[PDB]
Design a protein around this ligand. Structure first.
Ligand SMILES: [Ca+2]
Lengths: 215, 56
């Protein structure tokens, strides 16, 4: 699970979703009543989206289960370097937004290093949360020599201890109410000098809006 | 038996949670492991039949 994290207060992360194809394999974010944003390495031909979840193993009553109608990965996704690790999912029908199911805002601009963010995901299986800062690009590049592109950002602590892990990919990194990152990759989890690397969403706002409008 | 069949399972850097199969030499059969979603090595199968056929 998210290491060094804490259990999120019940339904305190209403934009968080679970990607299911028989079992939970990735996370995602609801950016509007019919579209979800996640990571491209979370791609599967058939995906069921589960919203309003807290305990992923029990039917609590506020969950909405919707099948994905369209899965669109970034045209420039690279499965080896992981550059442009972003994917859009259109739901079968619009979901009902409430206190347990809501949307998150796309970034107004790129958040600066030092900005405190909230990472969430599942890895009872309850939603886990983590407070961590966006790290400076130079600290990111130094942790992963020659592997960081301008579309990636590092979030966490260079001393390890706190990090996102397997089961969290596609999940949100929200800073000041705006989605600024998507859980993507890293070397190990919570390993010192190897903080999680995330997709820099501010670099895709236009692609995201263009794609949604056209589909 | 191919050498990639003796290598330990490789989760990878990605953080997806995908269940795959790998040949466990120590045990003598194919078992499941959590695959991260990218950079899969060869001892990584989508099923036990393929794993057993290939490395068995
Ligand atoms: Ca539930």
């Amino acid at each position: 699970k998210i290491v060094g994290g804490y259990t999120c207060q019940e339904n305190s992360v209403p934009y968080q979703v679970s990607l299911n194809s028989g079992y939970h394999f990735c996370g995602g974010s609801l950016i509007n009543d019919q579209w979800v944003v996640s990571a491209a390495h979370c791609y599967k031909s058939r995906i069921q989206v589960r919203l309003g979840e807290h305990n992923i193993n029990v039917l609590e009553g506020n969950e909405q289960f919707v099948n994905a109608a369209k899965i669109i990965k970034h045209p420039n996704f690279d499965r080896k370097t992981l550059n442009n690790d972003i994917m859009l999912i259109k739901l079968s029908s619009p979901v009902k937004l409430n206190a347990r199911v809501a949307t998150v805002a796309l970034p107004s601009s790129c958040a600066p290093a030092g900005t405190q963010c909230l990472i969430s995901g599942w890895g009872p299986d309850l939603l886990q949360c983590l407070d961590a800062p966006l790290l400076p690009q130079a600290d990111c590049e130094a942790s992963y020599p020659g592997k960081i592109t301008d579309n990636m950002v590092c979030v966490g602590f260079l001393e390890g201890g706190k990090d996102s892990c397997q089961g969290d990919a596609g999940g949100p990194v929200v800073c000041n109410g705006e989605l600024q990152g998507i859980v993507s990759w890293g070397y190990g989890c919570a390993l010192p000098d190897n903080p999680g690397v995330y997709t820099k969403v501010c670099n895709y706002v236009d692609w995201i809006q263009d794609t949604i409008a056209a589909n | 038996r191919p050498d990639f069949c003796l290598e330990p399972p490789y989760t990878g850097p990605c953080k997806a949670r995908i269940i795959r199969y790998f040949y466990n030499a120590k045990a003598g059969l194919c078992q499941t492991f959590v695959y991260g979603g990218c950079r899969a090595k060869r001892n990584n199968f989508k099923s036990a039949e393929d794993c057993m056929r290939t490395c068995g």
